[PDB]
Amino acid sequence: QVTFAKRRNGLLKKAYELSVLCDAEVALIIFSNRGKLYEFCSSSSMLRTLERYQKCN
Amino acid sequence: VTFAKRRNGLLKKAYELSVLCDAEVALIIFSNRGKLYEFCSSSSMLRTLERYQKCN
């Protein structure tokens, strides 16, 4: 997927921007079709954000 | 607020990435008031988070 790198980088960047601009807590997990993991979390740790998520629902 | 705009944009682009590049995507967003928004491309958010935990 020739556009994968571009879209991935764009999404990681915009996730970061949302967290910075709006004081929002953001977690983003991406697996490529080859199974490569890319991720962003705005908080002290991804685990903490996932734990926060589970507590709602 | 431009929170709404950027949020909607991110949710949409996450969807596009999953569809256009056959990628598995999970996205969790808490507003500064603690409102939860989310997108997951798979059958369930839990399954994708479980996949995530299995890596390093």
Residue numbers in the entry:
A (entry chain A): 18 to 74
B (entry chain C): 19 to 74
Tell me what the authors wrote about this structure, in their words:
The MADS transcription factors (TF) are an ancient eukaryotic protein family. The MIKC domains refer to M, for MADS DBD, I for the dimerisation specifying Intervening domain, K for the coiled-coil keratin-like domain involved in dimer and tetramer formation and C for the variable C-terminal domain important for transactivation and higher-order complex formation.
SEP3MI crystallised in space group C2221 with four monomers per asymmetric unit and diffraction to 2.1 Å. Each monomer adopts the same secondary and tertiary structure with an N-terminal alpha helix (α1; aa 18–40) and two antiparallel beta strands (β1; aa 44–48 and β2; aa 55–58). Each SEP3MI monomer dimerises via extensive contacts between the pairs of alpha helices and beta strands from each partner, with dimerisation required for DNA binding. In the structure, all dimers were formed by crystallographic symmetry, with dimerisation burying over 25% of the total surface area of the molecule. The formation of a four-stranded antiparallel beta sheet further stabilises the quaternary structure of SEP3 with interactions bridging the N-terminal DNA-binding helices and the C-terminal I domain helices.
